[PDB]
Enzyme design. Sequence first.
Site, PDB file in Angstrom:
ATOM      1  N   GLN A 233       0.674  -1.056  -0.102  1.00 16.31           N
ATOM      2  CA  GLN A 233       0.132   0.274  -0.011  1.00 16.31           C
ATOM      3  C   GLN A 233       1.164   1.162   0.246  1.00 16.31           C
ATOM      4  O   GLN A 233       1.027   1.905  -0.458  1.00 16.31           O
ATOM      5  CB  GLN A 233      -0.688   0.030   1.586  1.00 16.31           C
ATOM      6  CG  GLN A 233      -2.052  -1.191   1.032  1.00 16.31           C
ATOM      7  CD  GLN A 233      -1.424  -2.311   1.632  1.00 16.31           C
ATOM      8  OE1 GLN A 233      -0.163  -2.908   1.933  1.00 16.31           O
ATOM      9  NE2 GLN A 233      -2.326  -3.237   1.888  1.00 16.31           N
TER      10      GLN A 233
ATOM     11  N   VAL B 242       2.709   1.508  -3.660  1.00 18.23           N
ATOM     12  CA  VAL B 242       1.173   2.155  -4.403  1.00 18.23           C
ATOM     13  C   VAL B 242       0.490   3.480  -4.324  1.00 18.23           C
ATOM     14  O   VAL B 242       0.692   4.056  -5.333  1.00 18.23           O
ATOM     15  CB  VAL B 242      -0.404   0.952  -4.875  1.00 18.23           C
ATOM     16  CG1 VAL B 242      -1.187   1.540  -5.523  1.00 18.23           C
ATOM     17  CG2 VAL B 242       0.192  -0.067  -5.575  1.00 18.23           C
ATOM     18  N   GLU B 243       0.619   3.662  -2.920  1.00 15.36           N
ATOM     19  CA  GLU B 243      -0.386   4.905  -2.879  1.00 15.36           C
ATOM     20  C   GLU B 243       0.916   6.079  -3.480  1.00 15.36           C
ATOM     21  O   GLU B 243       0.817   7.717  -3.359  1.00 15.36           O
ATOM     22  CB  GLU B 243      -0.286   5.339  -1.341  1.00 15.36           C
ATOM     23  CG  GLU B 243      -1.632   4.426  -0.860  1.00 15.36           C
ATOM     24  CD  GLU B 243      -2.609   4.220   0.114  1.00 15.36           C
ATOM     25  OE1 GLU B 243      -3.370   5.500   0.123  1.00 15.36           O
ATOM     26  OE2 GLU B 243      -2.945   3.955   0.467  1.00 15.36           O
ATOM     27  N   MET B 244       2.148   5.838  -2.772  1.00 14.12           N
ATOM     28  CA  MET B 244       3.357   6.924  -3.510  1.00 14.12           C
ATOM     29  C   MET B 244       3.682   7.214  -4.670  1.00 14.12           C
ATOM     30  O   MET B 244       3.162   8.262  -5.140  1.00 14.12           O
ATOM     31  CB  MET B 244       4.746   5.912  -3.397  1.00 14.12           C
ATOM     32  CG  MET B 244       5.342   6.275  -2.014  1.00 14.12           C
ATOM     33  SD  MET B 244       7.050   7.350  -2.310  1.00 14.12           S
ATOM     34  CE  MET B 244       6.688   7.169  -4.402  1.00 14.12           C
TER      35      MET B 244
END
Length: 304
Positions: free
Chosen positions: A100, A103-105
């Site tokens: 997560q 991915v959020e980076m």
Amino acid sequence: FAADELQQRAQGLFKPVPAKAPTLKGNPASPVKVELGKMLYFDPRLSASHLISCNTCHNVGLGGGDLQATSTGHKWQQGPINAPTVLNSVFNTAAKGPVQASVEMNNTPDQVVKTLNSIPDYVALFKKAFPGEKDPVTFDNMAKAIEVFEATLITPDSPFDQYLKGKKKALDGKQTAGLKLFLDKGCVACHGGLNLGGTGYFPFGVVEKPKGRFAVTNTAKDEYVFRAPSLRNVAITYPYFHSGVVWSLKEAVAVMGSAQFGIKLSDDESEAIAAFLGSLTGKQPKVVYPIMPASTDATPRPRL
Ligand code: HEM
Ligand code: HEM
Ligand SMILES: [Ca+2]
């Protein structure tokens, strides 16, 4: 013997990497979910740019790391840090977790799920790996497949494991020396266990200064902890320390006979110790490169 006792000792203070992938809680393993996890781990379609996958920084054929001083791949990072190895990461304790944060980076959960929904093959694999679910293509399902693939990314049978297992002839002369020095010098306090490390945080970190351009410091005073790395496969995951500043593994042993620890180190004990650390290289996992399915007209495009 003075042996049967380095060895019956170490047998106590360390366990070997198990034969098989460990059980993850909430997240049972299966050929299919492992196939899926690996597809994802290698798919640069998880980044908004279509340029980066987890392998880019955690390269399974080059020790699980990226060979760079530092990088940023996780959203929780306050700036470039050295990429740890994925190898044997599952044994550590170091949307809060590695997939997560990655991915959020480089993307948003949203575009990632739109991307996976857009490719029939992935939908179908999500349905096999998470059956009896109304909608199995989730951000949380995707991290869970990757984690189960990560779990297989272990390195059984290094010369040392073969030693805690019984065989004293698994270590050579200079690595058996090195070991004793590693214990005797208390090494194993901070870097011991199933994973020789990956487990505690200490108000202790390697710093520049504005034989030893680099050394240790106390950071209690700053309520700053660093984790003490797993030392498994360290001969293959240079450069060393959170900032990736030491390239020689001998140096890195010489930076870790600090005043701050009550440890003196001779240039030749560092030697012995580096050669002990060499023994921690296990059998590199055998990964067939995944055949990742083609995008469709519905798949989002590289973003810029
Ligand atoms: C979804 C893909 C990825 C997966 C599954 C993954 C896996 C992990 C894991 C398990 C850790 C912490 C390991 C531990 O506690 O033993 C980690 C940390 C790290 N990775 Fe990744 N990783 C991914 C992508 C990347 C990328 C693309 C980069 C790019 C430059 C990168 C660079 C780093 C860095 C610097 C850390 C440590 C951050 C810190 O300690 O604050 N990683 N990754
Ligand atoms: C002679 C005994 C020791 C040796 C050979 C040793 C070895 C090493 C090596 C080779 C690394 C780099 C690993 C990497 O970059 O992946 C490291 C980092 C580290 N170890 Fe030591 N170590 C010893 C003693 C200790 C002690 C006593 C502690 C407890 C205070 C400790 C805690 C840590 C910490 C906090 C780091 C991270 C420093 C940073 O990244 O800035 N180690 N060690
Ligand atoms: Ca490193």
